[PDB]
Every structure is written in C-alpha cells, then in structure tokens.
Amino acid sequence: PMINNAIRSFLTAWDDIRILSPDVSSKSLSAYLDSAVANGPELII
Amino acid sequence: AYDFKPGITQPSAKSRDKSIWMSPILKLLCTSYAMTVAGPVRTSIVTEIDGSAAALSGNLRVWMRDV
C-alpha cells in the first residue's frame, strides 16, 4: 500500500548510494600495491 | 456483488478504511457487468485492481477534488 511505497523508496535510495562507488575487485589490490612501488630507493648499486 | 471475496480476489483490492464508500462503487461496477452479460445473472466478484485499492481511493479522491 502506502507502506510499500516507503519500502521501494528505501531500497532504491540505499542502492543508489551503493552504486555511487568505485568497483571493488582484485584489481584495486594491485592498484594500491603499485602506489608503493615507484617510491622505492635503489640500494643495490 | 462483492467488493472483496476473500478467497478468490487478490489482497491488492482490499479497500481498508474506504469500504464505506469504495464498496458502493465496487459493488455497482460488479452489477454493471453482470447485467451486461447475457444468460442468467451470475455472482459477481471483484478479482483485482491493477493498482492498489488504496491507489484507487486516492485517485478518486483526486477526481472528487477536481469536481
């Protein structure tokens, strides 16, 4: 009824916050680990 | 004529708190089609409303404000 309208205006208003987000995957682990690569000192010359 | 035949109809057509005035509309639309079909007069049952019955009680309330 009217209470069903508050249900679908809650689940969509929660999913629209959820889809406004970067996609989390295993690529983000390599993307974050690559940030700690270029800032490395050479010690072996 | 049924506004709500409880085993047959779907519960989307429950005119809760509006059956004092929606049921005279729903029973008379039942007889509006019973007297149109030929043959013997059959027991008429509201099956379902495409919206809610609350959606129809809201929309006729929009119409009764316009008139």
mmCIF file of C-alpha atoms in Angstrom, chain B residues 1 7 12-14 21 28 31 37-38 43 50 54 58-59 62:
data_model
loop_
_atom_site.group_PDB
_atom_site.id
_atom_site.type_symbol
_atom_site.label_atom_id
_atom_site.label_comp_id
_atom_site.label_asym_id
_atom_site.label_seq_id
_atom_site.Cartn_x
_atom_site.Cartn_y
_atom_site.Cartn_z
ATOM 1 C CA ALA B 1 -21.884 -8.218 -5.698
ATOM 2 C CA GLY B 7 -10.678 -16.488 -1.049
ATOM 3 C CA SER B 12 -4.317 -5.631 -3.506
ATOM 4 C CA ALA B 13 -8.033 -4.804 -3.809
ATOM 5 C CA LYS B 14 -8.518 -4.507 -0.035
ATOM 6 C CA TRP B 21 -17.743 4.446 0.138
ATOM 7 C CA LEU B 28 -22.142 -1.372 -8.544
ATOM 8 C CA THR B 31 -23.536 -5.294 -11.296
ATOM 9 C CA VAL B 37 -23.538 -10.448 -19.901
ATOM 10 C CA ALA B 38 -26.487 -12.386 -21.305
ATOM 11 C CA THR B 43 -22.487 -13.889 -8.691
ATOM 12 C CA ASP B 50 -4.243 -3.039 -11.238
ATOM 13 C CA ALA B 54 -5.705 2.481 -1.763
ATOM 14 C CA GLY B 58 -6.532 8.100 -3.643
ATOM 15 C CA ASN B 59 -7.201 8.685 -7.327
ATOM 16 C CA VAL B 62 -8.087 13.435 -6.665
#
